[PDB]
Design an enzyme around this catalytic site. Structure first.
Site, short mmCIF file in Angstrom:
data_model
loop_
_atom_site.label_atom_id
_atom_site.label_comp_id
_atom_site.label_asym_id
_atom_site.label_seq_id
_atom_site.Cartn_x
_atom_site.Cartn_y
_atom_site.Cartn_z
N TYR A 1 -61.27 -40.78 -20.67
CA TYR A 1 -60.40 -39.83 -19.99
C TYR A 1 -60.41 -40.13 -18.50
O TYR A 1 -61.45 -40.52 -17.94
CB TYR A 1 -60.85 -38.39 -20.24
CG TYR A 1 -60.26 -37.74 -21.48
CD1 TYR A 1 -60.57 -38.18 -22.77
CD2 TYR A 1 -59.39 -36.66 -21.35
CE1 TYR A 1 -60.02 -37.55 -23.91
CE2 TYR A 1 -58.84 -36.03 -22.45
CZ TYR A 1 -59.16 -36.47 -23.74
OH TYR A 1 -58.60 -35.79 -24.81
N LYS B 1 -56.92 -42.38 -21.56
CA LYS B 1 -55.97 -41.29 -21.65
C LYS B 1 -55.85 -40.70 -20.24
O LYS B 1 -56.86 -40.27 -19.67
CB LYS B 1 -56.45 -40.25 -22.66
CG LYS B 1 -55.55 -39.04 -22.81
CD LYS B 1 -55.93 -38.27 -24.09
CE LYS B 1 -55.14 -36.99 -24.21
NZ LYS B 1 -55.62 -35.97 -23.24
N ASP C 1 -47.15 -33.89 -20.04
CA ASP C 1 -45.91 -33.69 -20.81
C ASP C 1 -44.70 -33.46 -19.92
O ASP C 1 -43.60 -33.95 -20.19
CB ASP C 1 -46.02 -32.51 -21.81
CG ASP C 1 -47.18 -32.65 -22.82
OD1 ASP C 1 -48.30 -33.05 -22.43
OD2 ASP C 1 -46.98 -32.28 -24.03
N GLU C 2 -44.91 -32.73 -18.83
CA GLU C 2 -43.82 -32.32 -17.96
C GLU C 2 -43.38 -33.43 -17.01
O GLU C 2 -42.38 -33.29 -16.28
CB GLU C 2 -44.23 -31.10 -17.15
CG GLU C 2 -44.64 -29.96 -18.04
CD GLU C 2 -46.02 -29.51 -17.71
OE1 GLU C 2 -46.17 -28.71 -16.74
OE2 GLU C 2 -46.95 -30.02 -18.38
#
Lengths: 292, 293, 294, 293
Positions: free
Chosen positions: A137, A163, A189-190
């Site tokens: 991450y 990620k 996502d945005e």
């Protein structure tokens, strides 16, 4: 190739009964909904959106096996398997390898400000446990971490990439520039289109659970060079994200799925349990506005 | 429509002499260099990059006049004219109009945490001064935050055509583009240029365009041309430039590169660090040879 | 003990302006008289944030300094906040302060731009050369990169620098400075933690709130010196109740309206500060006075 | 009404583990003895952050509770931190606390996710029904984006006798003491012990009291004795000690100081760094000689 890591990877919800029991039948029904109705490219399991911290060690293995079984190799599989318990995480890596997971990931050590050194040792020991590609991450600071320093993590055995979930797109640009050999799955996502623009090809997100179609629209507009449409579709999608999370995220996704005949169950405590009618109307509102 | 606000608008540096006097012949040379050699679409004067907090009221008016003159209508002109003195601001706005500036802007009230109500009144007062388009600065938080909506009430003030957006928050920018498609948002974050274009920015204000307009224009060209990979590659190169450039003080580095190109861009004012001539000269060459050849 | 003159309460003085916006020169005198004679303060800190110094012209600043000197007539300790990004002006202000018999000067950190440590060091260094007058630096947590306890000492070792006005809400950094530098003077500028400051060795206090509640603030000090530990607690709760109530409207508009209510020609704030409706601010001034300043 | 039992020093107990990570059960007893008899504490706070609670199983936690209730035999006040994201395991641990005659329990803020106020409230609400034992809630600056008034509704929940307050925010602490005089606030910021005293704190929970309770008792005694200068000098020494101690990992330095006093307090569990054995022993020796003689 990282070809199997192209496209959309919903961060899969983990279904529970009303009483907090792992709803095994639900897990399979969810995987089927994602593969068959959402038409996803892959599934990211037992992450934050999967309520992984509320899962027992045995809950985890059960979900990993259940998902493997329902998928039947149709789509790419990634299991999030990190916790503070190093021994459990090691067995989980072996189990992912055994069950034919395409990759694993492990969230950064949390709660305490674990050091770069401690983080490095965390990820080093886990890589010897099994030969399965690992995604770390992204981590801005640990006790106080340059894009150069994060490189040390990137070169540990079996690590193929990261990620990337931070809202900092300059750091993302710097990483894409410095590590063109590494795989970066974009988890914001945005900012999907932004991601695409600096070279992201693979997306992990909560919101793809029930709007892969709306997200794929942005990707298809982008590849087809419809720049106006990239903008409009993003505005629409980010409208959807913001409407979605006006009630709890996992409660909403689970309710949207229930409204679509999928047995997706409920969140565990301590997540808030809405009245069935209240969350139903929310599910309908999202569905009618965005998912026709 | 907003066509005259497309392209690149360097945030112009303000030339001073070594002892910090307003270098008047420098101003015009910088303007020439920007129009003629950087081939800018516009110029943005007396902002942070132009060291405006280090300018007197008399310096500000003089710079506006020297810019207006040397330009000779060739490129679009925007003047940042804001400070805490509201009467000086109003006068600079009337001077802007007189000089046929295409737009003005005013920074957010600073140092003190001025409230929404105070900021709104401050822009409202400015609008009644002269009939010239105004760009407000984007406002994250005002004495404790401002929403897409609360910010829109600033956008509706008379003569306000839109906003100069410099924040590194690309979600908020996306939100503003969605909600206000009839407003002009000039994008001021040089290192996210392509990400700005992707969400609809067409005009760009920045300090880095003073000496690398060619490099930023390369990104824009590849974007409009749908060359996805060149967008990525050229941004990687451009952001390498940005990080390399600011390994020394921004304005000293930008003025040193201009001097290196034989442009009398002078020096920064106190209290910005003054480097040894040879140290900043080598920095300038390093940037020039790596990126600007 | 040469820091004796720096003990006690130092209101951060407001600067009176007319409704118009002009420097109200008569008001300056009345405010100074109000603070010496009614608030019974130990000193006055002038042209700081609270004095709206960023809305003052160069001439306004010199005028305020002269007028405060003349009105004080040496009664109490005077410290002048003189810093700005115009170094030549700050230099002249430092010479003026010396001329007018100010006890210390101070200079805010370079602001708005992210000035580096070397730039901040050089700024303070150039000033100290202008005149032989004690300097108090502002406490700096972070300059663009952290500033260490050891790094701040490089600023405290500059010629003429005797200490630091310390305004951060970090009382650990404060404890650490008092431990490392007991030869320096630390003027404590966080009014809502006065007793906390006392506890770690602060003897001087610069604050906006002492303009109209020196009595409340002195009561906490007295209770503390008397070892009345319960009263330190009670008097703080009350005082902090007063601070919160006070800043429910704009601070400087509240402070000036409270003075005007007591018949002191303190005037009004300049733009861009909010100008309250006549009665709204009067009623606020009445509330605070009735509740805390009886 | 009477909180006499919770006055004084309450070290956040370390949990002893073997070199290879098992729960060294007898080690737990040797630490409990050593804090009670040698550090002379007023109470122990068990299975907190300092007790590495997140690295303990449910069974481990039950075990440590039992072991501590045993090696203390009612000699000092006992507080159990029993909070986790598993509500049923917390509900059980609070019955185990009531059974072993623990004087108080606490539960940490729901962590990792941004849980809301409503969720936070309901979680304490649930934990209360479990067992009639007084609860101390952790002080919370913000939940999912937190009024001093809102924090009071949490104090109102059945069985809650107050709060463990750990924030570096001394203003909000002063505010809480002001509004809820009928509640116990345990002060959990070791470096500001004397400042907590000044505003009325009477019990102290912290990791540094594991090996330097004497040095901190020295501050409380000087304070009650109105020796202003020693309060200052003794705080300065204590805070030199605290920054010295944490120059290597906290739990490793503390455990290693204990092992240096012939206390078998073992080691940390993964993922905590494990020092080369001579490194941490030279660190144990330095702290002991400079501060603990």
């Amino acid at each position: 190739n990282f070809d199997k890591f192209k496209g959309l990877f919903p961060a899969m919800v983990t279904p529970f009964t009303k009483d907090g029991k792992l709803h095994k039948a639900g897990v399979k029904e969810v995987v089927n909904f994602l593969v068959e109705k959402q038409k996803v490219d892959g599934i990211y399991i037992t992450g934050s959106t999967g309520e992984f911290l509320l899962l027992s060690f045995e809950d985890k293995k059960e979900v990993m096996k259940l998902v493997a079984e329902a998928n039947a190799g149709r789509v790419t599989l990634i299991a999030q398997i990190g916790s503070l318990n190093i021994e459990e995480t090691k067995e989980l890596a072996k189990l992912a390898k055994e069950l034919k997971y395409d990759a694993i990931s492990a969230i950064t050590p949390y709660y305490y400000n674990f050091s770069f050194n401690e983080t490095h040792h965390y990820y080093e020991e886990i890589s010897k446990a099994a030969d399965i590609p690992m995604l770390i991450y992204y981590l801005p600071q640990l006790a106080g971490v340059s894009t150069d320093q994060f490189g040390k993590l990137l070169e540990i055995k079996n690590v193929i990439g990261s990620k990337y979930g931070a809202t900092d797109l300059f750091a993302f640009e710097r990483l894409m520039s410095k590590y063109p050999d590494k795989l970066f799955m974009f988890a914001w996502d945005e900012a999907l289109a932004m991601g695409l623009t600096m070279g992201a090809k693979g997306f992990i997100g909560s919101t793809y659970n029930v709007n892969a179609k709306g997200a794929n629209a942005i990707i298809k507009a982008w590849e087809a060079n419809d720049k106006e449409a990239v903008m409009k579709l993003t505005h629409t999608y980010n409208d959807y994200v913001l409407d979605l999370i006006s009630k709890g995220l996992m409660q909403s996704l689970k309710a949207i799925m229930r409204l679509h005949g999928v047995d997706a169950g409920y969140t565990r405590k301590p997540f808030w349990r809405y009245e069935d009618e209240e969350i139903k109307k929310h599910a309908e509102f999202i569905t009618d506005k965005y998912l026709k």
